[PDB]
Amino acid sequence: APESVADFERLLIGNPNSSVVWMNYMAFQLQLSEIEKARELAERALKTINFREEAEKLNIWIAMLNLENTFGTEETLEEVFSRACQYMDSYTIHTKLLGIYEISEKFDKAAELFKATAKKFGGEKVSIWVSWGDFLISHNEEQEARTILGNALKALPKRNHIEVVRKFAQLEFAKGDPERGRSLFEGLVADAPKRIDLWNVYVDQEVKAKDKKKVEDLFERIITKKITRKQAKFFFNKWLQFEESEGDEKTIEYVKAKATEYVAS
Amino acid sequence: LFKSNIFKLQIDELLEQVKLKQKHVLKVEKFLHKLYDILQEIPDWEEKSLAEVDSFFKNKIVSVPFVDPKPIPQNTNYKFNYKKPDISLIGSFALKAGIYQPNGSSIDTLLTMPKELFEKKDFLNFRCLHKRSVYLAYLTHHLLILLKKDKLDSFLQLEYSYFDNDPLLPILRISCSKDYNFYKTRFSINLLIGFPYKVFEPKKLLPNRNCIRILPATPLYNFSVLSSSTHENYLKYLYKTKKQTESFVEATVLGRLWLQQRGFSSNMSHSGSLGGFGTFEFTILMAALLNGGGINSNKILLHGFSSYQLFKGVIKYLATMDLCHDGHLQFHSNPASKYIDEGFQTPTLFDKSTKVNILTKMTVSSYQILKEYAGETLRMLNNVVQDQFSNIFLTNISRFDNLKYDLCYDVQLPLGKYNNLETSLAATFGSMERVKFITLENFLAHKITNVARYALGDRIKYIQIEMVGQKSDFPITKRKVYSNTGGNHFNFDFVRVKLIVNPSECDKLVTKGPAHSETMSTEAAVFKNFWGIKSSLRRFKDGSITHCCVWSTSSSEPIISSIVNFALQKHVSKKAQISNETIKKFHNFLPLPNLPSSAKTSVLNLSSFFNLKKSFDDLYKIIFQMKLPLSVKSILPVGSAFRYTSLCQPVPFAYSDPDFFQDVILEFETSPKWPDEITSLEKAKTAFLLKIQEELSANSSTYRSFFSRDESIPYNLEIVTLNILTPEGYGFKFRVLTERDEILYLRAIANARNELKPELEATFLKFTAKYLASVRHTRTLENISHSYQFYSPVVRLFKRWLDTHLLLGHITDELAELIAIKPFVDPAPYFIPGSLENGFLKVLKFISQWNWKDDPLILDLVKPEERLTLAQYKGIQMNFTNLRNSDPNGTHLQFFVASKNDPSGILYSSGIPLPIATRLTALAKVAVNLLQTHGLNQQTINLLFTPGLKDYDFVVDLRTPIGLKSSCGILSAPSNFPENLNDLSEKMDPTYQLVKYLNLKYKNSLILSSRKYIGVNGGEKGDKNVITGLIKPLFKGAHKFRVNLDCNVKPVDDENVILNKEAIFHEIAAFGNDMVINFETD
RNA sequence: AUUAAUAGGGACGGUCGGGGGCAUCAGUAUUCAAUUGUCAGAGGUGAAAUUCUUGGAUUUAUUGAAGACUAACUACUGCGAAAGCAUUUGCCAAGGACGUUUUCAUUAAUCAAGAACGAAAGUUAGGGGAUCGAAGAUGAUCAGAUACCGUCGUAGUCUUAA
């Protein structure tokens, strides 16, 4: 491997757009207890790489920040932050910083990183709200994610309402309160019972919680909703799929009798 | 890239300094060919029991070096024999790591034992170790017959030894005394015997498993058992690790260079010393660093990296990755290294394939002591300004016990014989206590280190109990290391306790403990037993309750000086007496201040100095808000009492000390209406201080008032100093300052011609250091002493050691304080200064090798981790090389003492004569050389304050009318002033102004130096002094007819004039006729 | 060396713009929450209805949190390739007009093909849902990846009026 001062520098003449060499060089420079040659390396790879490569350029600011996460300073990681906020996007380095502070064991600044990015990218983007949702319920703060989710309904337009309120449900069904996640599915299906895009993602997740009492109840009532033939026969195919996995073939037997009689009209 | 390449040129040349030639290794390996041939004819005898072994060797020359416990026939069932062993190479010469050293080294020629001669039960009851102690004397019995037959024994000798200073494996040593002649190479051949690789069970020979069943965990006994098998496989790792790294041996050479500087090597440290991890473990750690090192086996050091990367990263891993109380290191020789984050209360470097601890040789006392130097040495690889290659290895750090440590005491261990230890020590020493620590040199070594651990605790930085007089050698015709030294039967003469103390807790009186409760808690059980009647119930300031002990404060010793005698009295030895007689008389050379609890004031007690700062603040409190025509904006003193630089501690009503009035520099509002004349400048500012005196005379009758002119400014005779003495007894010399002071000085330089420009520039430096740069140094004087208050205990006494030798009359106190503050900001390669004995001995060695021509002084006024940058400190280097153009030998510019505020170097050290500076270094050369040659004793300790005053054409002995030691505030007092304040100066030093006129008139022919502090430097009366004076070199030859020779000379002919000493002796005699007592004329 | 298209690039310096990207600070106006005084109405309408209301609707005032924009000044005002564009100030790069006995001498004009900027827009229920396929369920990947690798399949993709 490249393990010398002359080794990784020679590869820069052959590979100018490769920040992966400087990603191992900063691991090779600061391993010798002198990170000033590693802070020089992330500064050098910015002016050596091609400007058309955005995968290594944004990662270069993510490299000097993650090096700053354990081995940096207070205002040095922030002066590199507002330099990446001018040369690149703001919240995408902050959603990288929210994942970095999730690993950095600084929950207080990550609480500040969730709020300071909520002023910029809370009103227009529905993306980081679920990122605050998964981080809250993993720390067992279930009502805290539910508090700003109503703020996330007051954050963006009516198009992001069906997107974000669905995203809180599967985040809670994974690691939070799935009864209020299914109540979000009970809310999104009572908001629009003619839109099967919320009930099917519920029926995929209710049959991912493996409750045949919960899944087949939402399966039996969806066929009696405003659904066509393709949402009648293929939703029965999800019913025969769920009855196969459980262990009672009686419900697998009459599921073909419930769908074929409903088409007999 | 300049931190590596300038280090690599300092690494590649330094490895060439110790360059071992191929000629020395030639006859050393050819003598091994005479060793391998003669051992190849060493035959095997028959198998015999333990009883037959003592029958054959008691009448023979060879004797078995049996370790404790020796074998007994009532417990010996197996047999013993000698065999033809498989000899091999291991160590430095097998990895090509050897180099030229003057003291010499040992060549580890390993002899592997035969596997069939050891049973399956060889690991327990010391069975295989009974084979190794018998076969090593047997192989020495066969080789001495073979080496005598080859007639090489005339300069070759055989004796007993131990491998790595561990007594559990008896071994022989071969050397050369003054074809096979290796006496020119000075390499010794260590005939080491090791066992076969895992001939016993390595899983059963781990640290937690025991091999003395009669069990408790035997970590050290299994360390000598299991590592006897790893001599071949671990060496095979470093054989191939040398081929994968181009600078494995070069960085382990710098690792061998750095570890030898602080006393770390392959010598054992459990026996009461410092060591256990040296060149053997660092090259092993360089194999673990070049094969991973992360917490999940990630990389720590590179394979293709050079010596600049492998040397710094491993010691930083020795500093930042803990191995003693927080974690442990893993290794595998048979696959990466992955550091274990669980500790075992000692150093534990895990060999996962060999089941032995590679850091087992170092105890807890020697583990953390190397880490404080590791972070110190790794910080030197982090600095981007100073050169750090000489600071690592080329500066010996292990010379004196008073140098690298704060205090070392001689506690004699008259413990006697082993069976009489039931009445010698308070400890119960049996067979089970001697299971893992079987050697008696190790048993009290960690016990007294643990008994001192409850005694000092956080008051020090480490613990080092040193076994002075303990060797490792024995005769092969003798049993082991036996001696009748010190009245005892131990493997030492005595023991010495060494530690580097932290000054914020080293003299604490309230010995803190755990909290009290309803029942005696387990944490409170140990502290109550350790103190007993000394433990009592004492509450806190905020309301907390805990069991604590109050200690006794003294002006000659710290609080730990009693506890080192206390904790050694109870549980170490009832007859042992610990005493530190070096730092006891060292504190007696300082002035004893006349205040309450003066003998009860420790060296850290600085309450008397800050109490004088309260009165001056109360003095400035009446000054600052007062209404005058010109308002005040600056009220600050630049005196030596507020900067802790006064030789006398500030006592009230003290009129006789020269540092009584702390100097004051004050400033008014910005004013263009100040006059632009020098005589009119001090005529106006004294008028605003006249109304300020008129405001102090009107409604401030508690403070007194008097005026005096300060003649310390050359060519300025219009200045006036305001002397205000408060009601408590502290006086200040108040002088104003404006923007017209440096205006009149710089206009005096440019307007004057090329003739008189120099003296008005030096008198401008008299106005610079007293008015312009006065408060700038006074701000950083009190500031950076908060990191090391021992500088204030040393630099007040380092001038007191300088004032006793007639040096105060030519140098200022600021350049004397910055000399003793060089080992505070730059203490390399020693520890942090923490005592007056440590501070004075650091200044004694540093001022010895202080060559004033080649290297100047640039000390950073920065606290512990404000300093000048790399571009700024190089600008300070530009002041040296340009001034040395017309002053190359230090005759016109000797002491270049510079800092961040004054990089000119000549702030307080310009205008001084070079010949007194030559004796200032000579008194630093002879005083430090006397410490290492004749030892350090109180005959020599007070001798540094004893000047002989030789090389003198003039030596004047005098005695004053009133002895003024008690009047200066020195308790061998001051209570009130007189009714008229003019009579207060009648008890001052009369030789201060008598010698002030001496250098004034006769400067061109006489070199006048004298003492300014006659109260402490007078002895009993506090009024005695002596002045050493030498004639100039230019006025030592005949000087022709001129007018401006400025020499008190006589007629020698009709053409030449010479300074006749007859009128020259009487001229200083007719002035001081009342003080005329004695005068030496040569 | 035939001239330096009162063609053109390029260069200097004085200007200027609601130009755009980023940042700065300032401004009123709105919602929601904490909460006091008090209610027979409050909102809406041509008249009503509807809506919340001794659950204090409603008015005033205060604090917190969040989102939008620069009224009067302010206009046939300039600018931006067009689309578009208004607090104070900057950074970076772009631009109308300017003068050179500044530099080059046609480097210059229209653009198929082919590419870059970019004005509006995603709501109700009916059918179809063959294909695709977000939502999600998924086996691998990297240290880590809700992405790139493989699949089923919901809304939709096709159409019907508001």
UniProtKB/Swiss-Prot annotation, chain A:
<protein>
    <recommendedName>
        <fullName>rRNA biogenesis protein RRP5</fullName>
    </recommendedName>
</protein>
<feature type="repeat" description="HAT 1">
    <location>
        <begin position="1"/>
        <end position="31"/>
    </location>
</feature>
<comment type="function">
    <text>Involved in the biogenesis of rRNA. Required for the formation of 18S and 5.8S rRNA.</text>
</comment>
<feature type="repeat" description="HAT 2">
    <location>
        <begin position="105"/>
        <end position="138"/>
    </location>
</feature>
<feature type="repeat" description="HAT 3">
    <location>
        <begin position="176"/>
        <end position="208"/>
    </location>
</feature>
<comment type="subunit">
    <text>Interacts with snoRNA U3. Interacts with MPP10. Component of the ribosomal small subunit (SSU) processome composed of at least 40 protein subunits and snoRNA U3.</text>
</comment>
<feature type="repeat" description="HAT 4">
    <location>
        <begin position="210"/>
        <end position="245"/>
    </location>
</feature>
Swiss-Prot record, chain B:
<dbReference type="GO" id="GO:0030686">
    <property type="term" value="C:90S preribosome"/>
</dbReference>
<dbReference type="GO" id="GO:0032545">
    <property type="term" value="C:CURI complex"/>
</dbReference>
<dbReference type="GO" id="GO:0034456">
    <property type="term" value="C:UTP-C complex"/>
</dbReference>
<dbReference type="GO" id="GO:0006409">
    <property type="term" value="P:tRNA export from nucleus"/>
</dbReference>
<dbReference type="InterPro" id="IPR035371">
    <property type="entry name" value="Nrap_D6"/>
</dbReference>
<keyword id="KW-0597">Phosphoprotein</keyword>
<dbReference type="GO" id="GO:0030490">
    <property type="term" value="P:maturation of SSU-rRNA"/>
</dbReference>
<dbReference type="GO" id="GO:0060962">
    <property type="term" value="P:regulation of ribosomal protein gene transcription by RNA polymerase II"/>
</dbReference>
<dbReference type="Pfam" id="PF17405">
    <property type="entry name" value="Nrap_D4"/>
</dbReference>
<dbReference type="InterPro" id="IPR035082">
    <property type="entry name" value="Nrap_D1"/>
</dbReference>
<dbReference type="InterPro" id="IPR035367">
    <property type="entry name" value="Nrap_D2"/>
</dbReference>
<comment type="similarity">
    <text>Belongs to the NRAP family.</text>
</comment>
<dbReference type="InterPro" id="IPR035369">
    <property type="entry name" value="Nrap_D4"/>
</dbReference>
<keyword id="KW-0694">RNA-binding</keyword>
<protein>
    <recommendedName>
        <fullName>U3 small nucleolar RNA-associated protein 22</fullName>
    </recommendedName>
</protein>
<dbReference type="InterPro" id="IPR035370">
    <property type="entry name" value="Nrap_D5"/>
</dbReference>
<dbReference type="GO" id="GO:0005730">
    <property type="term" value="C:nucleolus"/>
</dbReference>
<keyword id="KW-0690">Ribosome biogenesis</keyword>
<dbReference type="Pfam" id="PF17407">
    <property type="entry name" value="Nrap_D6"/>
</dbReference>
<dbReference type="GO" id="GO:0006364">
    <property type="term" value="P:rRNA processing"/>
</dbReference>
<dbReference type="GO" id="GO:0000028">
    <property type="term" value="P:ribosomal small subunit assembly"/>
</dbReference>
<dbReference type="Pfam" id="PF17406">
    <property type="entry name" value="Nrap_D5"/>
</dbReference>
